[PDB]
Amino acid sequence: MRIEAAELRILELPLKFRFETSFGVQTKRTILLLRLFGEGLEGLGEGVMERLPLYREETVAGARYLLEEVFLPRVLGRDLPNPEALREALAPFRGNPMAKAVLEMAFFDLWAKALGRPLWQVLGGVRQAVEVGVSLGIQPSVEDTLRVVERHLEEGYRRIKLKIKPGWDYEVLKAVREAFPEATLTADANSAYSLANLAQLKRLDELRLDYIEQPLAYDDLLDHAKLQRELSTPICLDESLTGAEKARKAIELGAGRVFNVKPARLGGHGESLRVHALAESAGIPLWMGGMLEAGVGRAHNLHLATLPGFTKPGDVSSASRYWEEDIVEEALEAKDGLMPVPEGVGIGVHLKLPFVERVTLWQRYMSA
Amino acid sequence: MRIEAAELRILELPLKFRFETSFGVQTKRTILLLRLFGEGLEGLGEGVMERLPLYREETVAGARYLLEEVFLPRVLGRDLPNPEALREALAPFRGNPMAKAVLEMAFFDLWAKALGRPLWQVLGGVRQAVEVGVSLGIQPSVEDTLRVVERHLEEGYRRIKLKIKPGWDYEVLKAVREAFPEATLTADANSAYSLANLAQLKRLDELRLDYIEQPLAYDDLLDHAKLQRELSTPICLDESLTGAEKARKAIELGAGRVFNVKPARLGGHGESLRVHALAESAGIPLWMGGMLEAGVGRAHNLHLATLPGFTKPGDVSSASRYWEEDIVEEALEAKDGLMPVPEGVGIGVHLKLPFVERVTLWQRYMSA
Amino acid sequence: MRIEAAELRILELPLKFRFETSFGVQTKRTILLLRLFGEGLEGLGEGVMERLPLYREETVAGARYLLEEVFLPRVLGRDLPNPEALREALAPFRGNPMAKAVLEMAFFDLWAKALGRPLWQVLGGVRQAVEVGVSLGIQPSVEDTLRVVERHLEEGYRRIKLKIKPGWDYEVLKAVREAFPEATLTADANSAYSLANLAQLKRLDELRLDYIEQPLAYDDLLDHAKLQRELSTPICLDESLTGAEKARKAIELGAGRVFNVKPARLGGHGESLRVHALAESAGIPLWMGGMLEAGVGRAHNLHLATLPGFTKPGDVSSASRYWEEDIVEEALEAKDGLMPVPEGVGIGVHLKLPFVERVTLWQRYMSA
Amino acid sequence: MRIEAAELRILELPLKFRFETSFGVQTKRTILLLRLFGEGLEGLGEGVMERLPLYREETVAGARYLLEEVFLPRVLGRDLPNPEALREALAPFRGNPMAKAVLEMAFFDLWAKALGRPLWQVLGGVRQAVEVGVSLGIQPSVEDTLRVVERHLEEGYRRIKLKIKPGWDYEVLKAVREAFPEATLTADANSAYSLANLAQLKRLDELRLDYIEQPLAYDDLLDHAKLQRELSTPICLDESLTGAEKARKAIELGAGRVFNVKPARLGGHGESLRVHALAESAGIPLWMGGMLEAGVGRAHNLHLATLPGFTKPGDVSSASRYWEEDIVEEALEAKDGLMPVPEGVGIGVHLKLPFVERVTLWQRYMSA
Structure with a gap:
């Protein structure tokens, strides 16, 4: 699979409930969303890191940087026969598993779709x-x-x-x-x-x-x-x-x-x-x-x-x-x-684009 | 993938060299060969067990019995979504990994072929x-x-x-x-x-x-x-x-x-x-x-x-x-x-059926 | 003791009760029976393996092959001073303890009888x-x-x-x-x-x-x-x-x-x-x-x-x-x-031959 | 096997070489010899303990007392089906393995002789x-x-x-x-x-x-x-x-x-x-x-x-x-x-009684 383009967005999605954390109470999620395009198909990935490193060390800002300026440029246009290839492509970069996961999981989705x-x-x-x-x-x-x-x-x-x-x-x-x-x-x-x-x-x-x-x-x-x-x-x-x-x-x-x-x-x-x-x-x-x-x-x-x-x-x-x-x-x-x-x-789900656009705080489209 | 039919053969191929073992010098391989048929495709599996249990405990005879009367009857005609389904189907049977391998590897071949x-x-x-x-x-x-x-x-x-x-x-x-x-x-x-x-x-x-x-x-x-x-x-x-x-x-x-x-x-x-x-x-x-x-x-x-x-x-x-x-x-x-x-x-190879028939000692065709 | 001949049979013996296993319910036993003849005496051995490898890896078919074509030919006519000799004779063959046991136990019976x-x-x-x-x-x-x-x-x-x-x-x-x-x-x-x-x-x-x-x-x-x-x-x-x-x-x-x-x-x-x-x-x-x-x-x-x-x-x-x-x-x-x-x-027991013949599914006599 | 009688002797045999020990140089072996009689057969046992406890703790004197007054009286005339029966008979007595060995080894000899x-x-x-x-x-x-x-x-x-x-x-x-x-x-x-x-x-x-x-x-x-x-x-x-x-x-x-x-x-x-x-x-x-x-x-x-x-x-x-x-x-x-x-x-050897008598320092015959 050759990834032809990718779109990264940061969304702010309201929570029905409000829950307390180690730094006050949280009421919304700031979500890094990734769409990977290839062979007329689209793979989807979602980040689990938050704005503050409370659960663990990564943040939306830190992962955004890595995905936009390091990881996507590393794999855009590359022929990746399978997810293992993608993993090896990102191997030089230490840590940051959640930032890597957005891309690795979106790619696994794209790959599974290409396999039908x-x-x-x-x-x-x-x-x-x-x-x-x-x-x-x-x-x-x-x-x-x-x-x-x-x-x-x-x-x-x-x-x-x-x-x-x-x-x-x-x-x-x-x-x-x-x-x-x-x-x-x-x-x-x-x-x-x-x-x-x-x-x-x-x-x-x-x-x-x-x-x-x-x-x-x-x-x-x-x-x-x-x-x-x-x-x-x-x-x-x-x-x-x-x-x-x-x-x-x-x-x-x-x-x-x-x-x-x-x-x-x-x-x-x-x-x-x-x-x-x-x-x-x-x-x-x-x-x-x-x-x-x-x-x-x-x-x-x-x-x-x-x-x-x-x-x-x-x-x-x-x-x-x-x-x-x-x-x-x-x-x-x-x-x-x-x-x-x-x-x-x-993964069997489809993005509701109009709504996603309405909750997008930032976005970027990159092509190979 | 549903396995519609299977053909099991026992072949004899002479080796070009003499192979020393713990009980004799071996000059021929007695090979259990399996062909799995499904969705118009053919998966191939080859047994590595021999006539005598010298490397380990299995024999061609013991493996032939398991594949012919136990494993194939159990999976023929069944919906096997992936290799893990095949694994679970054979789980009740203890040991006999080489006998299971003929079927499991032939299935992985057929499955990969079905995935293109x-x-x-x-x-x-x-x-x-x-x-x-x-x-x-x-x-x-x-x-x-x-x-x-x-x-x-x-x-x-x-x-x-x-x-x-x-x-x-x-x-x-x-x-x-x-x-x-x-x-x-x-x-x-x-x-x-x-x-x-x-x-x-x-x-x-x-x-x-x-x-x-x-x-x-x-x-x-x-x-x-x-x-x-x-x-x-x-x-x-x-x-x-x-x-x-x-x-x-x-x-x-x-x-x-x-x-x-x-x-x-x-x-x-x-x-x-x-x-x-x-x-x-x-x-x-x-x-x-x-x-x-x-x-x-x-x-x-x-x-x-x-x-x-x-x-x-x-x-x-x-x-x-x-x-x-x-x-x-x-x-x-x-x-x-x-x-x-x-x-x-x-696996990328194709059997030469004429030569295979000439070295076949026994065979059986089974369909769902 | 020199084993002069041996008779192997596969019997099907009905169970008074029916018991459930890891592969349905069983209602009968398929038993591999061995008679060893030497010095006018007869040693008896009985296999505990079944038709399916549920308790462990061996099967009646696999053990039958090993006893008929490998183990009995290995010891027929050989002078075995004691059970240790028999054990060493079968040492090259890995695993298959239950198949070996049929012969080793029948021989221990024959030996004990020869010792009076x-x-x-x-x-x-x-x-x-x-x-x-x-x-x-x-x-x-x-x-x-x-x-x-x-x-x-x-x-x-x-x-x-x-x-x-x-x-x-x-x-x-x-x-x-x-x-x-x-x-x-x-x-x-x-x-x-x-x-x-x-x-x-x-x-x-x-x-x-x-x-x-x-x-x-x-x-x-x-x-x-x-x-x-x-x-x-x-x-x-x-x-x-x-x-x-x-x-x-x-x-x-x-x-x-x-x-x-x-x-x-x-x-x-x-x-x-x-x-x-x-x-x-x-x-x-x-x-x-x-x-x-x-x-x-x-x-x-x-x-x-x-x-x-x-x-x-x-x-x-x-x-x-x-x-x-x-x-x-x-x-x-x-x-x-x-x-x-x-x-x-x-072992102090005697076969009821007419009944045994009636429940024999297969048999083979081999002599030294 | 029932032991009908036993003869215990203490012999002295000169060695052909001088043997260095932790307390003197040894030039003779003082040997406790046992003959067990049963079913018209004779079992032979020989003690390896010496006059001084140098190799280990037992002595000819200590072993002579145990065999003559404790072990033989306990087993004389008793039905001992096999060597394990003899072992159990002496179980209550702690240690003294060399003293027990004279009797146990003589018994194994007699038993093997009885088995032909x-x-x-x-x-x-x-x-x-x-x-x-x-x-x-x-x-x-x-x-x-x-x-x-x-x-x-x-x-x-x-x-x-x-x-x-x-x-x-x-x-x-x-x-x-x-x-x-x-x-x-x-x-x-x-x-x-x-x-x-x-x-x-x-x-x-x-x-x-x-x-x-x-x-x-x-x-x-x-x-x-x-x-x-x-x-x-x-x-x-x-x-x-x-x-x-x-x-x-x-x-x-x-x-x-x-x-x-x-x-x-x-x-x-x-x-x-x-x-x-x-x-x-x-x-x-x-x-x-x-x-x-x-x-x-x-x-x-x-x-x-x-x-x-x-x-x-x-x-x-x-x-x-x-x-x-x-x-x-x-x-x-x-x-x-x-x-x-x-x-x-x-054990395949036969005592030369005349020479044995000439080197006997002490002896005792006991019958059931």
Whole structure:
């Protein structure tokens, strides 16, 4: 496939809800969108980095620069027989997996479309519907927490994830467990702990959580391995998994027994397939993470989540929970705990251009 | 892709040289050949198992039974969206990777053909010629060894592999190394050693071999890991690597630092790609192994050997060194240390049915 | 002993009950039977492999080929002073322990008969009755499970083994434990788990099961060792123990604290004696596993189960639970939890030839 | 087999050479001889313990008391189906393996005789001649050492063992190695070192010795394991290997890579066969050790040395190097590096009662 042209845009998309972060509260998403054109087809890619480096180090500004002035010029007009070629073309540039992912994923979409197949089929998927889990923030009280969990269980979610922190973990989780003895419950420890809190984390073992996500430093594997050795509960890694080498080291160290997969965090689908092979060979369950994606990112996530190693519910809930209006024509809605994979070749969604234009803050067209 | 029909044959092809084994000297290959038919296309697969279980446990008879009465009946006429679907269909059957490989590799060929692409492109390859290494059995003398090695070096081979054994390792290898200080030299220790021979093997460290292949038991990883920790020379695993789980365990234990990849030994291309991801994530070099294949197998090996993790020369020399006449129309011949990947969709070779019929000992046609 | 002739048969023997497997439900056994003739005596061997490679990799077809065309021709007419000679004669052939076991065990029977002694006496046994345990599959409900366990306890079984799987383990086992506080209870985890399920398996520690059999991969030792390190409950290995070297590695790794011995799985009595020496030297209890054997296999198992290291009840229950008609004249029936060892030289049972002929699907006589 | 009666004697046989020990120079062997009578047959056993506890803790006096007043009274007239029954009968008595060995080995002889077979055949042997190595004490000089070694090499011995000690190891061994570059050379470090001497011992790695025997404490495994990890030369264990449990622990710790087997040190053939299974399962070579035995012991050693795991030459040289007259009619003489196993049922030798009576210091006959 020879990429003939590319269009990069920065969009500002309003969120239906408002959520708090480590730097105030966020109410909108600034999204880097990429369209790749080749052989009369169009591949789509969506950035998961934000304006501030809060989840991790990249920003929309930094990724925009790399894509516009380094990565697209590197691949425009080049004959790339497959996604591996694209990966090798970007190999000299260190880090920046999310910026690379926008292009790598858009290209995988374009390639799958040129092959005439749905993306999941090309990636090696084995299902066309994904189980849905939900994530809840820290609530004002134990009562409020039970209320929210009960409603989400009534709606059909197949796993409930609750945010915790020192001083707000055992009691609230224990109350939920007692009220819902058979619910699949997980904790998002949000890198709010250190090995100093080992006893507090071990205390959660009696609650039978499916896993405790990223309790220690966001870029750590060694201390998580020390922690995991002491817990019967699986430690699930998210921010620490930036690529296949880290996944390999996590397995060698025993740093986590469950992996949260976010393709963009990893650098794209090529890297995700490598992580999938690694996890599958070690019996490590995978589930699809969410990053408040608009329709393009959500569809990419759904196609990748069809792989055999994804055996646990992912954060791929209805687009309507996030956006009053999504950027694709499709209504990506789940029901009875399942989210179908959008039909069609590639990622199976189509941009709603007039709306996209209306929410474009900046744009640039480049041709080979 | 739905497999509409399949033809299985057992062929007998005389080799141009005498091949020493653990139970006799082999002069012919008994080959299980598979043709898969679907959507007007033909996928080709070739078995690497033999009449006797000498290299490993499978036999032509055992594999013929599984393919004819178990595997083909299970997949004939079924909708297989991709190779992963085929993998899952055969999952209930334990072991027998070479028997599964005939079908799985023939299917990958058919699938790539249905996608309209060369197999290497679908597998993630990044090159179209593979570096060629040569293998040498134990010679009557050191002078003879030197003579043969010198000849192969003049011929352009990029790696020389010498079979060794207790009592015939250090002096012969040391003589070759002194005569050819810059040559890439390798040893095939042929499972001829035990940890009792640790000293003899460690003595080879001074010769700067590129790797020592499978010196200990054919189904071991633990003792090889103990050996590897004592040697600076990389231990290369062959028979021990039967699948991705063994490869993951080899990485955890440090059982070897180079992997010999034989797709059929692993169960096919799907399994090889998983091993590739694992090796690549640990910086473990791969090279394509050989099993005296006729043209279909040699072509499959070439397409897989194009992947990025294959960084050392493979046993993919000219078909003419093996056969007076091969079963494919193409002349798979190397030149100046390089073997081109045959062009065309899928594996790129075509069977010469008239010659195939003349060397067919048995055949069966099956349709959905 | 010089083997003068051998007769191999494939029999189809109806099962009184019908049991479910990983590929539908089975209702009959396809049995490879071997008769070895020498010095006017006859040794008997029975294959435990089936038509499909579900328990492990071998099949009746694959073993038939090896015995008829490779192994019997290798030993017919050869002077074999003892079973060790037979083992060395087959050493060049890798794997296929069950196919080798048919011949090795038949020969051990013939040898013991030529020595004029019962097989147990020659193998080093110290008892003439074996304690009997029973194995139950997954039942429709906890109530049904209690019902079945209670009846088997009334009948006098000395150990009850219950099949479990993720989602069906703690609650059912806990209910049985509570209803029968002093019963010897074990779990057959049927390779249905991975290290991901560590917490679920550790949770069983409070139930005081005598052991949990083969919870992880069928060909694994490394992950079972990691699991065992976390459990007070002994992990019992079955499929992973394919020979003495694996038993040695299991001891080095601490992969299991109890071993299920199935002589055919191991390659025969010679290999079983080696495993017995290894286990006994590490204080690892042994018990006799069952593979739905007809009278020949059951008698072999009983004679081997007399060894000192077998300190726990085995799956050697009455032949009448399996067959409406067995292939030997003897009625191998247990009572009050004990199964006597059949009397006479060698394995002490005699073929009921007319019946055997009636259930023969194929046969072949070969002479030296 | 029921032992109907037993005759125990203490003999004194003058040696043809002076034997250096830790407390005097020995010129005579004081031998505990046992004759077991049953079913008209006679089993022979010979003690390897001496008057002083120099090699290990037992003495002729201590062993005489145990056999005469404890072991024989316990087994006389009892039905012993096999050697395992004898083993269990003596189980309550701790240690004293050499005293138990006289009875256990005499019983194995009687049992094999009752079965009508050569002892090696019943033990699982696969050969009828054993390779012969020779031992040399510390000589007055390096030249003397060279002279002796040269002579033994001309004589056909297949391994040369040289006693060494701190201050007399590297230079003497290096001189021998230079003079005989191809000779199989071994060292008997005689428990003369400690980990304090790690450097002196590691210095020997360059000499390519086949093994270094028992350099550290006679009852140690832990320190030898620490030493072995630092040496490429295999450490060979002798005094430390008192039974199968110690052998299992030596394998777990990696305390040695070669085992010297002396059946009496181990408690007999039953224990030796267990050690054999352990060593074989770990690829640890065995060789038959010597204890200056008269003909009965030398014959027992030869029959046991036929087992497959014995792959290195043993100290089983000609009886004539030790005795002007031996206690058996047979002339146990080696030729061209090989010692034949004496023919006949059991150990194959016959006592010359007249000579035995002349060298008897004490005797006692006991009947059931």
